[PDB]
Amino acid sequence: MKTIIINGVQFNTDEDTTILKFARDNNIDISALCFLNNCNNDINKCEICTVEVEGTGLVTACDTLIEDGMIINTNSDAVNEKIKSRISQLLDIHEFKCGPCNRRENCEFLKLVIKYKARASKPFLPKDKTEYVDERSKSLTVDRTKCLLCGRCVNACGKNTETYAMKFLNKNGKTIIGAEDEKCFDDTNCLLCGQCIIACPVAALSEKSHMDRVKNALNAPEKHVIVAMAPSVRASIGELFNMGFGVDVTGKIYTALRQLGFDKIFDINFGADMTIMEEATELVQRIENNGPFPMFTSCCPGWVRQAENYYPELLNNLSSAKSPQQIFGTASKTYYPSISGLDPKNVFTVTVMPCTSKKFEADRPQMEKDGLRDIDAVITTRELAKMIKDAKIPFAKLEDSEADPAMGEYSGAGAIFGATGGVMEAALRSAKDFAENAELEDIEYKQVRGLNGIKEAEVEINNNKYNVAVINGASNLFKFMKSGMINEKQYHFIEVMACHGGCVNGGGQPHVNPKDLEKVDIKKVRASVLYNQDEHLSKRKSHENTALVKMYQNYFGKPGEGRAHEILHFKYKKSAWSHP
Ligand code: SF4
Ligand code: SF4
Ligand code: SF4
Ligand code: SF4
Ligand code: FES
Ligand SMILES: [Mg+2]
Ligand SMILES: [Mg+2]
């Protein structure tokens, strides 16, 4: 039993919780900065959450437990002067130039600087930013002129992936964040999943920009620029246009893309149906051959890097079907010329992804054929929003349009790919039809859905029982492997997503400030858009996609053999033995 006084208001409570959490639950404003994911920066507390506790003095609300008898003041002059001072000291290490900054519209530090009217003691104005910037990665970029040393990226990497690939380092006698030994992230165990970017309150961590690749292609007279968006983009991008959360903006995106000058509007959900054709065909082959097992998905490039970096002995069990991004891109340089008359060399294929790891996937050396890359550029959901705003397109006011259908139609199975368990559910819908040679009516697999970290299910296919698992976040992959769960039974098909929640929570998604994250379950709300589409779509199985059926009939032949196997697949292998 506890009685506490906050700003003169008495509260009676039995809760055991921090001052910050209690205050937020009771509509009392306390500021915070380094607190995120239930953790603050223990070795360098920001102290933005400072409050006064009578008899004790100034304390950090984000990590101090309420106790019976506490009398708390959150808004005294002494408290506010301390907070202002901490913000001023951060400005002393921050290049405060918001005009061209990519977080200008949604920066948590700027909000605090305005709120406390803080100013640097000395403006931080480095003349040469070269030593502060790291753009070596295909996926991530670091600008340490903006870094507050808040630790949010370090903590988020450990929580989300358990790789600890993001670290505090000593560089030239100064503390920075970066990769192991200050190497390029891509050359370390890093997954390039971008959860560190999602955790950053400022513009210090960003995606590696592909915006100039795209602009130059749009402006080249002879290039025919295809664009296709991932499942999750249509459930997410509206957030950056003050539209709120959970808004389906599929048709507005198609219109915006035409206004930006793209030459063909397709959809990666078509590629998702392609991946299902190959992946369900492979699963059925393995079922009819009673092996090999388990089969892992290979469509999340964060998981592919996790397997390469930590479980190379599993690479032979990964599916060889290309991911929807790469399988679509392969078809865009082969099938698409065959139905359009375009010279393949002049097609430039752009995807819009909720993902930074997809930029590494698209840039893998062997993701090409006959000199033509499968995918020429990958922009994130955030990059597309900036492109729209730079062009002055009034996004929230646009009318709906449709995709071009030849590589644009999608079934409901493809639409759900962006949520954890979506690939599994989509694959089972086709595998059961294929193996049983039937058109089954019961197609919903709710047991694989939702935010649990490890989700197992038993499925009956062709009068035998099989075991499936959906691994939801890279940290949960480690738990599943390290605890021996992989050996507790025979698994037959396993989905792995590196980002908890699936691609709707990817590393290229709009930032959400900590207060909105408490108010809204972003992973569930974004996913609900995708499940709503599947419910209302006429075709809810990938192999019922009419444009896809035409494409295989006229160009690829049978899935899993012949031309389809030759060009639509990509096999991972552990490295050849060498010493040292
Ligand atoms: S990170 Fe925030 S405060 Fe710093 S320059 Fe960019 S918008 Fe301004
Ligand atoms: S990209 Fe993912 S694995 Fe790499 S440092 Fe960031 S959070 Fe960690
Ligand atoms: S990169 Fe961003 S999240 Fe990481 S310590 Fe710097 S400001 Fe904080
Ligand atoms: S879960 Fe999706 S967004 Fe996250 S790394 Fe994998 S493909 Fe990228
Ligand atoms: S928010 Fe409490 S110490 Fe940083
Ligand atoms: Mg702490
Ligand atoms: Mg053009």
Author numbering: 1 to 580
Article, verbatim:
pmcHydrogenases are metalloenzymes that catalyze the interconversion between protons (H+), electrons (e−) and hydrogen (H2). Among them, [FeFe]‐hydrogenases exhibit the highest activity for both H2 production and oxidation. Their catalytic cofactor, termed H‐cluster, consists of a [4Fe4S] sub‐cluster ([4Fe]H) and a diiron moiety ([2Fe]H) bridged through a cysteine residue. The amine base is connected to the protein surface through a conserved proton transfer pathway (PTP) for rapid H+ shuttling.
Two crystals of 1.39 Å and 1.5 Å, termed CpI‐CN−‐1 and CpI‐CN−‐2 in the following, were analyzed in depth. The refined occupancies indicate that the OCS is fully occupied by an extrinsic ligand in CN−‐treated CpI, whereas only 71 to 93 % of the OCS of CO‐treated crystals hold an extrinsic ligand. In the two structures CpI‐CN−‐1 and CpI‐CN−‐2, the distances between C299 and the amine group of the [2Fe]H subcluster are larger than those in Hox in both chains A and B. The side chain of E279 is slightly twisted and consequently closer to S319, whereas the distance between E279 and Wat1 increases in several cases. Wat1 and Wat2 are also shifted; in all cases, Wat1 lies about 0.6 to 1 Å closer to the surface. Consequently, the H‐bond length between C299 and Wat1 is longer than in the Hox state. The electron densities of E282 revealed varying conformations. In chain B of CpI‐CN−‐2, E282 is twisted towards the surface and out of H‐bond length to S319. In chain B of CpI‐CN−‐1 and chain A of CpI‐CN−‐2, this residue was modeled in two conformations. The structural changes in PTP elements observed in our CN−‐treated crystals have been proposed to be necessary for efficient catalytic H+ transport, but they have never been observed structurally in wild type [FeFe]‐hydrogenases.
